Design a binder for this molecule. Sequence first.
Ligand SMILES: OC[C@H]1O[C@@H](O)[C@H](O)[C@@H](O[C@@H]2O[C@H]3CO[C@@H]([C@@H]2O)[C@@H]3O)[C@H]1O
Ligand SMILES: [Ca+2]
Length: 740
Amino acid sequence: SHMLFDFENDQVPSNIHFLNARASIETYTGINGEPSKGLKLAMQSKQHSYTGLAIVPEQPWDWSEFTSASLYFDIVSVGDHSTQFYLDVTDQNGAVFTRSIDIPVGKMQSYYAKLSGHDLENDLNLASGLRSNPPTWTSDDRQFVWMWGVKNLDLSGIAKISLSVQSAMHDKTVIIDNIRIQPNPPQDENFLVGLVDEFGQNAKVDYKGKIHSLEELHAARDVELAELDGKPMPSRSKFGGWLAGPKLKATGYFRTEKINGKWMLVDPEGYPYFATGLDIIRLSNSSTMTGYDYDQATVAQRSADDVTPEDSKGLMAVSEKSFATRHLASPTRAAMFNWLPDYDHPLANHYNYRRSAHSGPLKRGEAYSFYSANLERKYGETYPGSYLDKWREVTVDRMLNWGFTSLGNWTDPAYYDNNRIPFFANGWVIGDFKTVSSGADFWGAMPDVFDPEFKVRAMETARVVSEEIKNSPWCVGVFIDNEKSFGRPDSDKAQYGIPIHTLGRPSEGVPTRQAFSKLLKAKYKTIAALNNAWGLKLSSWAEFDLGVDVKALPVTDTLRADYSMLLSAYADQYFKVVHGAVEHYMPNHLYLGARFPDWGMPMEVVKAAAKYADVVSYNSYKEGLPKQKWAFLAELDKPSIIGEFHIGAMDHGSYHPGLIHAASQADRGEMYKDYMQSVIDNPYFVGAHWFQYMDSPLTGRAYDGENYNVGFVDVTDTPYQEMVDAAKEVNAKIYTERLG
Ligand SMILES: OC[C@H]1O[C@@H](O)[C@H](O)[C@@H](O[C@@H]2O[C@H]3CO[C@@H]([C@@H]2O)[C@@H]3O)[C@H]1O
Ligand SMILES: [Ca+2]
């Protein structure tokens, strides 16, 4: 194709810029086995949470002739750690896409990111409904995995090519060579055909541990069941705390306390407690859209009062009447599957049906859970559905064997009386209340928390959670909601997106806007004072109260101060209402906040949670908890919990490793241990939960197409032994590390 950088002139090129990284040209051994010159990039990524290089041509490259082509890099890690690279490609209009992949130590390989062609011809997926696809051609090269952003850049002007390492726990070093563009090979018209075998596995790729028959599955089951004796790790108290104490005052419920400078939970009997475990201990998210649909008059409709969003509903039992009306809605989906059972087949009962979807080519449709089918294959039936009871018992035996102290978030309520391991409960506050927007809402619109109907719904949410947990001492506490779009950290406008978007609306029929207006009047009194403040020329408060377009205003210190007031009042009201509901129906139990992702934790909102929540919860998909990124915790002095993290890999058939990437199954375990060490060393954290128990389906979970290697078990319900070992290493030292 077209060689951009081969480094053979021994220069570090002046249009490649470095950020917290040292670059030089070094002879190394390339893919063709010959010594060659490459760019050695030693990133100072232990110290700095963003490191990397950026190629910035003096004028954007005009690549418009490349109508079907990819960008290639030869890359390899050097030293002790694999490197997850983020590739960010930015065009001359500011449009960006992000791909990512693991870069192992050892053998150099070629990595490519498509610029145009093939499968590039709130939907983070490719057309298929997979977050990232199998390759559209066969080669030994590795495809950069799709993450997010604009599929089709303006190729007549590529402005920036960025490779970065972010929030690492270690210095990372790579060698890079042969940066080039190549036309795409012809597209394999079968690239999405026959992806899945009868077990839910990658049909086209054999890999270590793959199941090739029913008897191998039974052999896997027999080996494991032989080792599970139901026994907890040593010195765990009844409720999974630390028997060696010091023993503290016992209240009969889980609670928080600072134990010699380190925040802890304290179990119902008074023993120090630290929460470890897995999220999604349920079957709801294990189904994948098959491509078929049913007659709508055969489908039960959602009640408007239901507290449970569609994504979190139990797998729906599909009726024979429904199945009789089966028709093809997506040929592309349907051709993915080598095996799906007839309605007559004993495994037909693992069909599901979703009535909505966040992302993907179908808004609704038939889905099949291969994991669930494999439970039945593994454990059989001694009575209808007995494989589900057996799954739960095995699941609990596993967690105790593996040393986990809890069942994490989104545990099926059938586990809530297990009375062998504590669990975390959850509810979602959903309904018909009025909404507001941040201007970039990810999962859905934000609630208008000043609408009385929002409180009516928070109350019903808590009521139902309360009826599920039956005031049990086994419930560590209650998460409410998840990853709400309180505002992105990219810029002041993004962060204050809720105030900005809401200010643009009228006060009439917008209760959050009325609350905001009240605060600004009390601050400024007259319209002329507000005019001076905001640089506006409004004729009256009445005019102000019709809505003002402040999106257009650059954010000044005055504007920032006013937006901060408004966002604080919004978050205060949210947490106040949710906390009041939880305390009303579950007065004994901890309220665990709203699970802030890195893209939705503006400090005004964190502060509001620290006021009402007993434990502030954050989701953090990174290689660990970097010092500077989490220094703000000292200010709040609140016990905190990681609700989600994970590390995935692509050596066990998955097309997508997940959010954070390892070189292999063993490397996943090593990265789990590094992540958990950073939680364990942090004095504000009282636990961390891994998302999630099982891999997502190879062809994408029905809700939004995530198709990640993020399980402790694969589609066949076989544990990843490298993850088991890493969890046991961690779980053996959680208490000795925190207490001494
Ligand atoms: O295009 C939107 C993206 O923006 C990126 O900046 C986020 O890191 C991404 O974060 C992801 O968002 C949700 C889907 O995967 C998880 C990840 O944090 C969240 O659940 C995503 O929000
Ligand atoms: Ca070279």
